[PDB]
Design a protein around this ligand. Structure first.
Ligand SMILES: CN1CCN(C(=O)O[C@@H]2c3nccnc3C(=O)N2c2ccc(Cl)cn2)CC1
Ligand SMILES: CN1CCN(C(=O)O[C@@H]2c3nccnc3C(=O)N2c2ccc(Cl)cn2)CC1
Ligand SMILES: CN1CCN(C(=O)O[C@@H]2c3nccnc3C(=O)N2c2ccc(Cl)cn2)CC1
Ligand SMILES: CN1CCN(C(=O)O[C@@H]2c3nccnc3C(=O)N2c2ccc(Cl)cn2)CC1
Ligand SMILES: CN1CCN(C(=O)O[C@@H]2c3nccnc3C(=O)N2c2ccc(Cl)cn2)CC1
Lengths: 307, 307, 307, 307, 307
């Protein structure tokens, strides 16, 4: 059972696709194992780049194909390198840019916590043939957190395991466990942009909605919530067109639903204030003055949606 | 007639193109058929990965090309593996990402039922040369329905059948039936996002539209439905910029039309109210008070569109 | 002069690009021609799939390149197959997906009739070297038009001709006419979406524009016409974002220009009615009541557009 | 010094990318030169299609690589052809699709004059080794300009010149001038769509803005200018979503700023009119009756854009 | 320790992706080194183009792969050229187009200062095997600055350095410093388009907002502030849709925030003016006439955000 020791060097994690639950990783794989000793020129290690690697594989060099289990599509492999040592050991070094897949929950956007994952697994060789000895992951990142969209928490957490593959086994009974390296990088979204540019003005819109009650006439009170309604639509349009695509409501979506709610609720009280009377124009002196009543009724219903 | 056994492993079904009637399928194919026995190194099955498979083919390994009938474009093939057993049998295993085509009706969106389909068929060998012995499909999915756009329902239908290509047959008469594997995976759309952020406020807009009759003045009444019209336009827009491209009207698309209708029907009633008179300002006390007439008249005419 | 029988089987015609004048065709080419008899294994027809065709060609197999004349870029090719019969004859079968070029008039959108074309031609052999014996095209489609964007009308037109490249001929004089196959598929656009979701409400906006004249005051008449204008801009905006980009105006675009007009004409009359007076508010006592005059005056200006 | 004759046949010029200063050119390249006499099968010219050309190159056939100096990326090449004549001469024919770069000024859009340029040059051979003997360009386009976005004007300009790369020469001193073919194709934009759907309504918006002065009251005069303001924004938007992305203002863009200006200037005058007084309500019966004054001040700013 | 002399020729720097922090570079690499003397045809340096380069490599030509350290994905390579001299020296020449990554701060857009960076380093060989003797960069760009998006300021930066990978060294101890060429080009953004088309009209929007205090009534003062609010939303939208996407606010983003605030402060002062009284309509003679107060109060807070 060949021991393969791995090092992944992560260069940039970028381009998160909310819809596809996808993110881009550029970096390097280094894979090392020990073969039977060789005679290299001089005595110095033999270097074999790109094209020539296939030539060595033809003359019988075992260079096992390691699949990125959760890569969507197949990665752009940059340069490849075989490092063949005379003491026997073999190093395969190559650059890759890949699009990777992971479960991503975006429901509390723009306050999501996500985690970026890599899954390596030898493509054709079982655990009894090729085994992952160890893995080091190097996230050569740090600093400039507010210039980048995401805050990396940890240093990269790792777990090597055995996967079975209990569908038709049968082919090779007793031996259908593959060893799998699983690298996880934890991360937090830097919400500033979304707070100041989406959350804040959506609030000023929402708040200023409640100023509909400081209007004197019923005609004023009502004709204005129609403009005010048109505003939340202008906003939802502005919001939706800019924000990441998801198949669900995020927190910001709910804020917008709440805007439609306060305003539609406003419409109802306002019409109600007017026509519920003991004459015709008996506008409920206190209900018309719910100018404080439901702004804080919104903030109570607001603090409960937080739970 | 070579018996070929297939097993398809479905990893991710994503990216439905509504206009193109398209979806993405990531997975693995395993194909097995049995040959004349080989003398393999050691005695354990021989592994041939990617490039070396072509090398084996140039030397006469029969690897029959299995075509994805309904793949739009030609799939992204990942690692390929030939697994050659001494008892003769041959296993072809490769990872694939493909764009598949199937008839998709999205009329009752966002509540569509869809079925993601795969059709396998040997590219050059007929039922009398190469035959599909059996096929199993494994969708090793589970959990997180409320996170995903699509909810898979069954375990996946399978069907092997025989296709008669009766166009110039003639070339090889009597032997022009190809055997076809058909996988069908049932699905339902996640209607939550479309309900809460589209259906709901669209209703509040349509509903608030009716509050125009609670206005005292005629000029207020009329000038108002023009802001109100401007609303359903800004809203139809927000919908169409965000919702999926189609060549037909969905349930939402209709709501928008009924939206335009209520307002335009209103405008007419309002002018009628005013100008159908025996003086100038004889507003039909009852017709100006059709505040209940067409709000509940909209629910009957609205629900008849459901039949 | 080698006789080539061609047969194209059309699977999907999708993805029309209105600015670039483009469409996608997925299907298969089958080309048949006859060589000197071969000694094939058994005596049965010899099959050569993908990778191997190029190999036979290094050993002198003439497999002439047939070019897609009006293809944009170079086609996505699926599986290749040579079918080599012992009596001499040779059949080439391949799958393709290509983006094709053709003149397309979209002036009468959403009611265009279009025709999707394939133009095949030998890439290197003239009419005296390679000639198209015949060509048949099978678009084994039918049914479900109300699901697809386009409705195919005919069964496909065919045309074999001779193309005379008379630019420097000279090199090989008297012999530079290549034989060309031309396929034609007629189609009609499915106007349903555009009828209900563009034409109808745009008609309602314009119609409701005319309701400006039932407004009592001048202040009312002119201000409401500003909202009216903004609704046509909001509509102008919703139209252009969803509708296909063209370098010319369609029918829907004109309805829009007509909209801005009916509204701008009213602005002018409305100011006129009021300021053309013998006192100050002498709205030409009758002209303000052109409530019927220019709506049907619009429909006549509308039918002058039948020309 | 090898004499090479070139002929380019342009099939389609399309897809102008304003931002990147790029356009697509599809066509064929033909190059002819005279080698040492050969013995071809029969004695008529030998044809070598695609794959097979490298094979001929591997055996010492000089097929010199001619680079498209201004191509963005590397061209999509379709079928390749070698034509080997017994008298020595060699013909290289290939189809290409390329994105080419040239300086493009889009300021006076939608009436720009652009020129599509192709630049050809041997990649590895200097003027003393390989020289462009002559070149002719064929624009086999014609008819129906009214359906196409761009109108090709001339019959294509041609220039063979010598480029002196005087950077370290040194390597090969006295000999580092490359021969360069320059093709120029002038064209004009189809101004129809933009005149009718941008300029005409952009104008009617700006014009109707001026009706603010026929409003009687000060509220009306001031408040409407705000609604009037929102319209130039909504119009600014539609303009921006549809029109080409540039790093500078176009004519229309300036038209839009002028819309914003006329309205902001009106805001001031309207306020000035009201408050420049000898009472409170000394509304300049005249400055409020600059109803003719500043529409022609706009026609003046309009004619100043020409100076 | 092989001396490699490098020269980069920059053709075009374009296509900057703000979210990915990406930009496109088209140009040429020249690499020169001296090997052991060769026997070339004639005595003139031998030319080996594209395809034939690998053929020389398979015969043992050392052609070391130079990695673009900071490239995103792997470059589109055009023509390659090997120039093999009799005296030993070898020149590698290739055109390339790549997307490169560099840290980009876009906080004070549109008044950005950026620097476009290229990083070269041998993929497999350290400082002791392969060393960069010198490098010159030629950016033969100039002029028409007001036509191109970015104004290249300095000439070109050059820095050869030694990178110490101190990760498992071990494998090759004492020798794991690679020599790195770093090219820096400074550039400044052309702020014209965003000034004249964004900054300016945004300013006129904000300013014309303050005129709400010149309105006589409270309803005039309040209701208009809502149309004023919807106008900022409209502008936010138009801005957002056109401007480059980033994860943080730029200057324009703040202007919009300031716009939202100014309107909300107005909603407040205005309601307050009205209800802070000793009667009911005692509109504070100074606070109603904060017509100068907070137009200038915005200018100090506007001037303090700059400092
Ligand atoms: C990464 N590597 C290991 C797994 N492979 C694989 O084994 O494929 C399928 C697979 N994919 C998903 C889930 N289960 C299975 C399974 O049981 N397979 C299988 C089963 C038998 C044989 Cl001979 C080959 N493959 C592809 C290459
Ligand atoms: C998957 N497969 C079966 C179909 N092949 C082929 O049959 O293509 C066509 C095809 N496509 C669609 C409908 N009918 C036909 C037909 O009659 N064909 C055909 C073409 C050539 C020959 Cl020799 C025999 N048959 C190619 C490979
Ligand atoms: C199908 N086809 C590809 C184009 N080929 C070719 O003929 O190239 C050009 C071409 N393209 C478009 C229009 N006319 C011509 C012409 O007259 N050509 C030409 C010019 C010289 C020689 Cl030797 C051969 N052909 C020939 C066969
Ligand atoms: C078509 N083409 C191929 C590449 N060639 C080349 O000359 O590239 C560079 C280049 N590109 C742009 C501007 N100047 C130069 C220069 O002086 N070069 C150069 C550098 C070294 C050597 Cl040996 C030869 N040429 C020139 C002709
Ligand atoms: C340009 N070139 C040199 C080095 N390569 C390389 O060094 O890969 C990794 C790498 N990438 C990023 C950061 N550090 C390292 C490291 O220490 N590696 C490594 C791992 C094993 C061996 Cl033998 C040599 N080097 C990449 C290609």
């Amino acid at each position: 059972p060949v021991d393969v020791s791995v090092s992944i060097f992560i260069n940039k994690i970028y381009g998160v696709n909310t819809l596809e639950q996808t993110y881009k990783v550029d970096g390097y794989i280094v894979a090392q194992w020990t073969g039977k000793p060789r005679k290299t020129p001089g005595d110095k290690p033999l270097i074999v780049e790109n094209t020539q690697i296939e030539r060595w594989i033809n003359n019988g060099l075992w260079v096992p194909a390691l699949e990125f289990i959760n890569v969507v599509g197949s990665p752009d492999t940059g340069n490849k390198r075989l490092m063949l040592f005379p003491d026997g050991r073999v190093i395969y070094n190559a650059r890759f840019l890949g699009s990777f897949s992971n479960d991503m929950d975006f429901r509390l956007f723009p306050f999501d916590r996500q985690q970026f994952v890599l899954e390596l697994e030898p493509f054709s060789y079982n655990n009894q043939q090729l085994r992952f000895s160890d893995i080091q992951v190097y996230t050569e990142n740090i600093d400039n957190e507010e210039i980048d969209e995401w805050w990396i928490r940890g240093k990269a957490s790792t777990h090597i395991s055995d996967i079975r593959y209990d569908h038709l086994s049968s082919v090779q009974p007793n031996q259908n466990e593959f060893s799998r390296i699983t690298v996880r990088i934890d991360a937090v979204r830097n919400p500033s942009y979304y707070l100041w540019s989406f959350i804040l003005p959506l609030g000023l819109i929402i708040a200023a909605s409640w100023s509909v009650f400081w209007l004197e006439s019923f005609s004023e009170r009502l004709q204005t919530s129609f403009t005010l309604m048109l505003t939340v639509v202008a906003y939802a349009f502005y919001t939706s067109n800019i924000l990441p695509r998801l198949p669900y409501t995020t927190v910001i979506d709910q804020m917008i639903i709440a805007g439609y709610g306060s305003i539609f609720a406003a419409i109802l009280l306002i019409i109600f204030a007017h026509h519920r009377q003991a004459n015709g124009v008996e506008d409920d002196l206190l209900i018309q003055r719910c100018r404080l009543a439901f702004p804080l009724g919104f903030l109570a219903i607001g603090c409960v949606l937080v739970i």
